[PDB]
CSV table of C-alpha atoms (C1' of nucleotides) in Angstrom, one decimal:
chain,number,residue,atom,x,y,z
A,24,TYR,CA,143.4,158.4,96.5
A,25,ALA,CA,145.4,160.4,99.0
A,26,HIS,CA,147.6,157.4,99.7
A,27,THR,CA,149.7,158.6,96.8
A,28,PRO,CA,151.1,161.8,98.4
A,29,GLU,CA,152.4,162.9,95.0
A,30,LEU,CA,149.8,164.2,92.5
A,31,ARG,CA,150.2,167.4,94.5
A,32,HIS,CA,152.1,168.3,91.2
A,33,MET,CA,148.8,168.4,89.4
A,34,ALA,CA,147.4,171.6,91.0
A,35,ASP,CA,145.6,174.4,89.1
A,36,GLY,CA,146.0,177.3,86.7
A,37,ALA,CA,143.9,179.7,88.8
A,38,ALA,CA,145.2,181.6,91.9
A,39,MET,CA,148.7,180.3,91.0
A,40,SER,CA,151.3,181.3,88.3
A,41,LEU,CA,151.3,178.9,85.4
A,42,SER,CA,154.4,178.6,83.1
A,43,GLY,CA,157.1,176.2,81.7
A,44,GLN,CA,156.6,172.5,82.4
A,45,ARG,CA,153.5,173.4,84.6
A,46,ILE,CA,151.0,174.4,81.9
A,47,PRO,CA,147.4,173.1,82.4
A,48,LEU,CA,146.6,169.7,80.8
A,49,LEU,CA,143.4,171.2,79.3
A,50,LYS,CA,144.5,174.7,78.5
A,51,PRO,CA,145.6,174.8,74.8
A,52,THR,CA,148.8,176.4,73.6
A,53,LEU,CA,147.8,177.9,70.3
A,54,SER,CA,149.1,181.5,70.4
A,55,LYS,CA,149.1,184.2,67.8
A,56,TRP,CA,152.6,183.2,66.7
A,57,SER,CA,153.0,179.5,67.6
A,58,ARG,CA,150.1,177.8,65.9
A,59,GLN,CA,150.2,174.7,68.0
A,60,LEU,CA,147.5,172.1,67.6
A,61,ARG,CA,146.0,169.5,69.9
A,62,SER,CA,144.3,166.1,69.3
A,63,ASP,CA,141.8,166.6,72.2
A,64,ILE,CA,140.3,169.7,70.6
A,65,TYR,CA,140.3,168.0,67.3
A,66,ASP,CA,138.1,165.1,68.4
A,67,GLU,CA,135.5,167.4,69.8
A,68,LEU,CA,135.3,168.8,66.3
A,69,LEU,CA,135.4,165.4,64.7
A,70,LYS,CA,132.7,163.8,66.9
A,71,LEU,CA,130.3,166.7,66.5
A,72,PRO,CA,127.5,166.6,63.9
A,73,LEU,CA,128.3,169.1,61.2
A,74,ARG,CA,128.5,169.4,57.5
A,75,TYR,CA,131.9,170.2,55.9
A,76,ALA,CA,133.9,167.1,56.8
A,77,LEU,CA,137.1,168.4,58.4
A,78,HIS,CA,140.5,167.4,57.4
A,79,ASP,CA,142.0,164.2,58.7
A,80,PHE,CA,144.3,164.9,61.6
A,81,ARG,CA,146.9,162.9,59.6
A,82,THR,CA,147.0,165.2,56.6
A,83,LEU,CA,146.7,168.2,58.9
A,84,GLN,CA,150.2,167.9,60.4
A,85,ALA,CA,152.9,170.6,59.7
A,86,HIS,CA,154.9,168.8,62.4
A,87,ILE,CA,155.0,165.2,63.6
A,113,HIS,CA,167.8,161.8,51.9
A,114,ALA,CA,171.5,162.3,51.6
A,115,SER,CA,172.6,161.6,55.2
A,116,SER,CA,169.8,159.2,56.1
A,117,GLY,CA,166.8,161.4,55.4
A,118,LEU,CA,166.6,165.2,55.4
A,119,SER,CA,164.2,167.7,56.9
A,120,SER,CA,161.0,168.7,55.2
A,121,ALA,CA,162.3,172.1,54.0
A,122,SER,CA,163.4,170.3,50.8
A,123,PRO,CA,167.1,170.4,51.9
A,124,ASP,CA,168.1,168.9,48.5
A,125,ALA,CA,170.2,165.7,48.0
A,126,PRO,CA,173.5,167.7,47.9
A,127,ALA,CA,172.5,168.5,51.6
A,128,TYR,CA,172.9,172.0,50.2
A,129,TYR,CA,170.1,173.8,48.3
A,130,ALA,CA,167.0,174.3,50.5
A,131,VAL,CA,163.8,176.0,49.8
A,132,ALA,CA,162.2,179.0,51.6
A,133,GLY,CA,158.7,178.2,52.6
A,134,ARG,CA,158.7,174.5,53.3
A,135,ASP,CA,159.5,173.8,57.0
A,136,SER,CA,158.3,175.6,60.1
A,137,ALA,CA,158.9,174.6,63.7
A,138,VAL,CA,156.4,177.2,64.7
A,139,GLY,CA,153.4,175.4,63.2
A,140,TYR,CA,152.9,177.6,60.1
A,141,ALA,CA,151.6,176.0,56.9
A,142,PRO,CA,149.3,177.3,54.1
A,143,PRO,CA,145.7,176.2,53.8
A,144,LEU,CA,145.0,172.7,52.5
A,145,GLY,CA,141.7,173.3,50.8
A,146,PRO,CA,138.4,171.6,51.6
A,147,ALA,CA,138.5,167.9,52.1
A,148,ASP,CA,135.3,167.1,50.2
A,149,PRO,CA,135.9,167.5,46.4
A,150,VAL,CA,132.1,167.6,45.8
A,151,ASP,CA,130.9,170.3,48.2
A,152,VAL,CA,130.9,174.1,48.0
A,153,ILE,CA,131.5,175.6,51.4
A,154,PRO,CA,129.4,178.8,51.7
A,155,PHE,CA,131.9,180.9,53.6
A,156,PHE,CA,135.6,181.6,52.9
A,157,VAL,CA,137.7,182.9,55.8
A,158,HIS,CA,140.6,185.0,54.7
A,159,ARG,CA,143.9,184.7,56.6
A,160,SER,CA,145.6,188.0,57.4
A,161,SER,CA,148.7,189.7,56.0
A,162,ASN,CA,150.7,187.7,58.6
A,163,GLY,CA,149.0,184.3,58.1
A,164,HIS,CA,146.6,184.4,61.0
A,165,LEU,CA,143.0,183.5,61.5
A,166,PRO,CA,140.3,186.1,62.1
A,167,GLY,CA,139.4,185.3,65.8
A,168,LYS,CA,140.5,187.8,68.4
A,169,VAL,CA,139.4,187.8,72.0
A,170,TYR,CA,138.5,191.2,73.3
A,171,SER,CA,137.2,192.3,76.7
A,172,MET,CA,133.9,193.9,77.6
A,173,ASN,CA,134.7,197.4,79.0
A,174,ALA,CA,138.5,197.0,79.2
A,175,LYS,CA,138.7,200.3,81.1
A,176,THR,CA,137.7,198.7,84.4
A,177,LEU,CA,139.6,195.6,83.3
A,178,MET,CA,136.5,193.4,83.4
A,179,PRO,CA,137.3,189.7,83.0
A,180,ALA,CA,134.4,189.2,80.5
A,181,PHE,CA,135.6,188.4,77.1
A,182,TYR,CA,134.1,187.9,73.7
A,183,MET,CA,135.4,187.0,70.2
A,184,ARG,CA,135.3,188.6,66.8
A,185,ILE,CA,135.9,187.0,63.5
A,186,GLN,CA,136.8,189.9,61.3
A,187,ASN,CA,138.0,188.4,58.0
A,188,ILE,CA,134.9,186.3,57.1
A,189,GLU,CA,133.6,186.3,53.5
A,190,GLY,CA,130.9,184.5,51.7
A,191,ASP,CA,127.6,183.5,53.2
A,192,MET,CA,128.6,184.6,56.7
A,193,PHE,CA,125.2,183.7,58.0
A,194,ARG,CA,125.7,180.0,57.1
A,195,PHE,CA,129.0,180.6,58.9
A,196,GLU,CA,127.0,181.7,62.0
A,197,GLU,CA,125.1,178.4,62.0
A,198,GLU,CA,128.1,176.2,62.1
A,199,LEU,CA,129.3,178.1,65.2
A,200,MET,CA,126.0,177.2,66.9
A,201,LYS,CA,126.6,173.5,66.5
A,202,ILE,CA,130.0,174.0,68.2
A,203,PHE,CA,128.9,176.8,70.6
A,204,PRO,CA,125.2,176.1,71.3
A,205,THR,CA,125.1,178.3,74.4
A,206,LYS,CA,127.0,181.3,73.3
A,207,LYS,CA,125.2,184.5,72.3
A,208,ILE,CA,126.4,184.7,68.6
A,209,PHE,CA,125.8,187.9,66.6
A,210,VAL,CA,126.5,188.8,63.0
A,211,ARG,CA,127.2,192.0,61.1
A,212,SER,CA,128.4,192.5,57.5
A,213,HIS,CA,132.1,192.3,58.3
A,214,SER,CA,132.4,190.4,61.7
A,215,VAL,CA,130.7,187.7,63.7
A,216,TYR,CA,130.7,188.2,67.4
A,217,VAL,CA,130.7,185.2,69.8
A,218,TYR,CA,130.2,186.3,73.4
A,219,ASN,CA,131.7,184.8,76.6
A,220,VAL,CA,134.6,183.1,74.8
A,221,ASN,CA,137.9,183.3,76.5
A,222,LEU,CA,141.3,182.6,75.0
A,223,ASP,CA,140.3,178.9,74.9
A,224,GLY,CA,137.4,179.3,72.5
A,225,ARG,CA,139.9,181.0,70.3
A,226,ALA,CA,142.0,177.9,70.0
A,227,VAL,CA,138.9,175.6,69.5
A,228,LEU,CA,137.9,178.0,66.7
A,229,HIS,CA,141.2,177.6,64.8
A,230,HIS,CA,141.3,173.8,64.9
A,231,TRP,CA,137.9,174.1,63.1
A,232,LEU,CA,139.2,176.6,60.5
A,233,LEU,CA,142.3,174.5,60.1
A,234,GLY,CA,140.6,171.2,59.6
A,235,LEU,CA,138.1,173.0,57.4
A,236,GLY,CA,140.8,173.4,54.8
A,237,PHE,CA,141.2,177.1,55.5
B,1,A,C1',118.0,235.1,78.9
B,2,G,C1',119.8,231.0,81.9
B,3,U,C1',124.6,225.4,83.9
B,4,U,C1',129.3,220.4,78.6
B,5,U,C1',132.2,213.7,82.5
B,6,A,C1',133.4,211.8,73.5
B,7,A,C1',127.3,205.6,74.5
B,8,U,C1',131.0,203.4,68.0
B,9,G,C1',137.0,200.0,68.9
B,10,U,C1',136.7,196.3,60.3
B,11,U,C1',141.9,194.2,55.6
B,12,U,C1',149.2,196.6,55.3
B,13,A,C1',151.0,196.0,61.6
B,14,U,C1',154.1,194.3,64.6
B,15,A,C1',152.3,195.9,71.9
B,16,A,C1',153.5,189.3,78.2
B,17,A,C1',156.5,190.3,82.3
B,18,U,C1',160.2,190.1,86.7
B,19,U,C1',164.8,191.4,91.1
B,20,G,C1',165.5,195.4,97.0
B,21,A,C1',170.4,194.9,92.1
B,22,U,C1',173.6,192.9,89.0
B,23,A,C1',170.9,190.1,86.2
B,24,A,C1',167.8,186.1,84.8
B,25,U,C1',163.7,183.7,80.7
B,26,U,C1',158.7,178.5,79.0
B,27,A,C1',157.7,185.0,82.5
B,28,A,C1',152.2,181.2,80.1
B,29,U,C1',148.1,184.6,77.4
B,30,U,C1',145.2,189.4,75.2
B,31,U,C1',143.6,194.4,73.2
B,32,G,C1',144.8,199.0,70.3
B,33,U,C1',147.8,202.4,62.4
B,34,U,C1',149.5,204.3,68.3
B,35,U,C1',143.0,205.7,70.9
B,36,U,C1',145.7,211.2,75.5
B,37,A,C1',142.9,217.5,75.3
B,38,U,C1',137.1,216.8,79.7
B,39,U,C1',135.6,217.3,84.3
B,40,U,C1',128.8,221.0,86.8
B,41,U,C1',126.4,226.4,87.7
B,42,A,C1',125.7,230.3,91.5
B,43,A,C1',127.9,231.6,95.7
B,44,A,C1',130.0,234.4,101.6
B,45,G,C1',134.6,235.6,104.9
B,46,U,C1',139.3,237.0,102.3
B,47,U,C1',144.2,237.7,100.0
B,48,U,C1',147.4,240.4,96.5
B,49,U,C1',149.5,244.0,93.4
B,50,U,C1',149.6,248.7,92.0
B,51,A,C1',147.0,253.3,92.7
B,52,U,C1',143.9,257.6,94.6
B,53,G,C1',141.7,260.6,98.5
B,54,A,C1',142.2,266.5,103.8
B,55,A,C1',136.0,270.2,98.7
B,56,C,C1',134.2,265.6,104.5
B,57,U,C1',135.8,265.1,109.3
B,58,G,C1',140.6,265.3,111.7
B,59,U,C1',145.3,268.5,114.2
B,60,G,C1',149.2,273.6,112.2
B,61,A,C1',149.6,278.7,110.2
B,62,U,C1',148.4,283.7,108.4
B,63,U,C1',142.9,286.7,111.4
B,64,U,C1',145.6,291.4,116.3
B,65,A,C1',138.5,294.8,119.1
B,66,U,C1',130.8,295.6,112.4
B,67,A,C1',126.8,294.2,118.6
B,68,G,C1',123.8,294.4,124.2
B,69,U,C1',125.0,293.4,130.0
B,70,U,C1',126.8,292.4,136.3
B,71,U,C1',131.2,294.0,139.8
B,72,A,C1',136.0,299.1,142.0
B,73,U,C1',139.1,295.9,139.4
B,74,U,C1',143.1,295.9,133.2
B,75,A,C1',140.9,290.4,136.7
B,76,U,C1',135.7,290.0,135.9
B,77,U,C1',131.3,287.4,137.2
B,78,U,C1',129.2,287.4,133.1
B,79,U,C1',126.9,287.8,127.8
B,80,U,C1',126.6,283.8,125.0
RNA sequence: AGUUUAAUGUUUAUAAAUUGAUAAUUAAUUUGUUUUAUUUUAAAGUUUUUAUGAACUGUGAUUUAUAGUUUAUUAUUUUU
């Protein structure tokens, strides 16, 4: 379909600067600070065979009455008193707890002192600036081995290792970081 | 006796860039309670700063004739 001479606009994210309106239609946008979520990533997690039924993408949204409805920060009816931790245009929201009230998840991930999730993408031999990255899930707790297994059903072909404190997943760029959170979000953590 | 490039990145916690400039901002998106000190061994021509050296070998200045001999010559040809 070269008859449409437009579509040049869909181009790349490699060899060319990517920013603003031109952000790749596959590349997620979940950063450390803007916890943006995506429905594409969430279906991969919802169409995969796993235990621990994730949370419905309906009851997972932190973002989609005096003067015809007021914001979700509990701005009160007087359109005056409002409450501190109730609305967040950056995507922040506390955990929702596991979705199955009959199951005991064997691992508990612990958000950090700033409300993050334990996955951080490092580089192998950063001295030479080698573009070979892995992950590390530092705040795991519980039966972290039965946490390793669930990562296999998501990442079947990634060399996954486990120590007492962390869980390394190798060859996982900034994208496999996002895909990890949507799991730990939907998981109720 | 005898020769040195730290094989490790766990909870307070936060590290993006860009103009020749003013400046401008979807500058996409990491890492680090801040990680710094190290870089063989032996080994020539050489340089440099001060120093010393005439008991050696170098050139002054005070010794004014303890030896045999040739030619008249005080010069000598010698002696040596």
